[PDB]
């Protein structure tokens, strides 16, 4: 009846969008991740993909091209690419991989 299932592609953008949203609203503005907000994503739900829970600054600079210290929705979204890349890519140069 109600609660109709959409396509697999609508399912998967939603599941990441809701997760995003449960971090975006942590501090000022429920769209932008600020620095802490951003670090909270990786440090909690990302211990394997990007095991670098120390050089989040590097990611931040690599992401926030304008260096406003807000990853707007679309800026933040960049990470998901680096994720979706890493899962295939991860270190296809040395490791290996798996």
């Amino acid at each position: 009846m109600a609660a109709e299932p959409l396509t697999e592609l609508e399912e998967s953008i939603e599941t990441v969008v809701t997760t995003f949203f449960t971090f975006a609203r942590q501090e000022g503005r429920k769209d932008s991740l600020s620095v802490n907000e951003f670090k909270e994503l990786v440090t909690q739900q990302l211990p394997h993909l990007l095991k670098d829970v120390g050089s989040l600054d590097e990611k931040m600079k690599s992401l926030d091209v304008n260096q406003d210290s807000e990853l707007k929705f679309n800026e933040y979204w960049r990470l998901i690419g680096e994720l979706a890349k890493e899962i295939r890519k991860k270190k296809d140069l040395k490791i290996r991989x798996x």
Binding site: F21, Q26, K30
Partner: protein, 133 residues
């Protein structure tokens, strides 16, 4: 029959069991009289949560962490709001400035202030109080 006002959130048998100590958890039981608070609208829209005849008075820790026992500090003043989802909403005016409104963890306890914004559904509490109908 204004009496023991039961309140909880998140689908699943779990009730807010308050203890004089302060460590209130989402106990899924109704045998021991420790899951009832005297919820009422003190001021225009301002509702207070005080487990008088069962536990203690609430006193949020800067919204971030929800607790109660010593004194019902202003932190315990929340704006009564209703959502068209069969759930009650309470905005901690004391921290409304940060868009923070009381949120508890059904399987953890009441303490999600840094996550009391639009993201966690646990903010939509389901009340089962004995109204005067």
């Amino acid at each position: 029959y204004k009496k023991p006002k039961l309140l909880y959130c998140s689908n699943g048998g779990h009730f807010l069991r308050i203890l004089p100590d302060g460590t209130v958890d989402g106990t899924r039981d109704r045998s021991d009289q420790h899951i009832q608070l005297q919820l009422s609208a003190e001021s225009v829209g301002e509702v207070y949560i005080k487990s008088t005849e069962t536990g203690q008075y609430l006193a949020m820790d800067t919204d971030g962490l929800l607790y109660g026992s010593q004194t019902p500090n202003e932190e315990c003043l929340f704006l009564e709001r209703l959502e068209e989802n069969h759930y009650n909403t309470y905005i901690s005016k004391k921290h409304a400035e940060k868009n923070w409104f009381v949120g508890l963890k059904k399987n953890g306890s009441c303490k999600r202030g840094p996550r009391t914004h639009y993201g966690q559904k646990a903010i939509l509490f389901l009340p089962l109080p004995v109204s005067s109908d």
